[PDB]
């Protein structure tokens, strides 16, 4: 039993809800919130900009130190940093950004990072401003993640389309 509320159960381990991931994280304070990161951990827009804003830019300050020490992430890769006021930890995961010409096959590699954590609150990787098809992102999530994932979909119209088209 965990404190996630109002989710539709898609499979044994995947759950989905129309929700603002920022507001969800503040309410649940999960062990792990997933950020839709880029390799530079520059949290400007989309989920990343919203999460970073909610931390009063502390996420960005921490991230800049991480990059100065370690260099950029790989597309498909991840790092664990603080969750600040939103969660215990933030798993920054880089899905491919189609608007940059990155290989969509890397989406599966990106979701594999979730398997290192027993329970996560997450967005759909590569969706929104990363330009991939969200129906595809959900399919890859369900077929790749084996740990318990609670997906927040910000857009209600998209949420309804995601549920009604789910196989
Ligand atoms: O990963 C892309 C998604 N973006 C977010 N998801 C959840 N919470 C969010 N807050 C701000 C942006 C954001 C798209 C895909 C479906 O719905 C929005
Ligand atoms: Cl987005």
CA of 48 to the centre of ligand 2 (A): 8
The 10 Å Cβ neighbour count of residue 27 is 12
Name the closest-CA residue to atom 12, ligand 1: 47
Burial class (CB in 10 A: 0-12, 13-18, 19+), 130: buried
Resolution in angstroms for this experimental structure? Answer: 1.0
Q: Indicate whether residue 76 lines ligand 1 (CB < 6 A).
A: no
What is the edge-to-edge ordering of all strands in the sheet holding 8-9? Answer: 8-9, 14-18, 148-153, 119-122, 32-36, 89-93, 78-82
Are 18 and 153 a contacting pair, CB within 8 Å? Answer: yes
d(CA 167, CA 159): 14
In CATH, the architecture of 8-163 is: 3-Layer(aba) Sandwich (3.40)
Determination technique used? X-ray
- Using alpha carbons, select from 39, 88, 34, 42 the residue that is nearest to residue 62: 42
For ligand 2, the distance from its centroid to the CA atom of residue 142, given in whole angstroms, is 20
Determine if ligand 1 sits within 6 Å of the CB of residue 46: yes
What is the 3-class SS of the chain, one letter each residue?
CCCCCCCEECCCCEEEEECCHHHHHHHHCCCEEEEECCCCCCCCCHHHHHHHHHCCCHHHHHHHHHHHHHCCCCCCCEEEEECCCCCCEEEEECCCCHHHCCCCCHHHHHHHHHHHCCEEEECCCCCHHHCCCHHHHHHHHHHHCCCEEEEEECCHHHHHHHHHCCC
The CA 55 to ligand 1 mean position distance, Å, reads 17
Which is the closest atom of ligand 1 to the Cα of 49?
Answer: 11
| CB 153 less than 6 A from any atom of ligand 1 | yes
- Cα of 64 vs centre of ligand 2, distance in Å, is 21
């Amino acid at each position: 039993v965990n404190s996630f509320s109002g989710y539709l159960k898609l499979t044994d381990n995947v759950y989905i809800k129309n929700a603002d991931i920022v507001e969800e994280a503040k309410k649940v304070k999960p062990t792990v919130v997933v950020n839709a990161a880029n390799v530079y951990l520059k949290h400007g827009g989309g989920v990343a900009g919203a999460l970073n804003k909610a931390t009063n830019n502390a996420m960005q300050v921490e991230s800049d130190d991480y990059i100065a020490t370690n260099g950029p992430l790989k597309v498909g890769g991840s790092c664990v940093l603080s969750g600040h006021n939103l969660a215990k930890h933030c798993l920054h995961v880089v899905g491919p950004n189609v608007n940059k010409g990155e290989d969509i096959q890397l989406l599966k590699s990106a979701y594999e990072n979730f398997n290192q954590h027993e329970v996560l609150l997450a967005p759909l990787l590569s969706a929104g401003i990363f330009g991939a098809d969200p129906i595809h992102s959900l399919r890859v999530c369900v077929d790749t993640v084996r740990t318990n994932v609670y997906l927040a979909v910000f857009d209600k119209n998209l949420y309804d389309k995601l549920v009604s088209s789910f196989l």
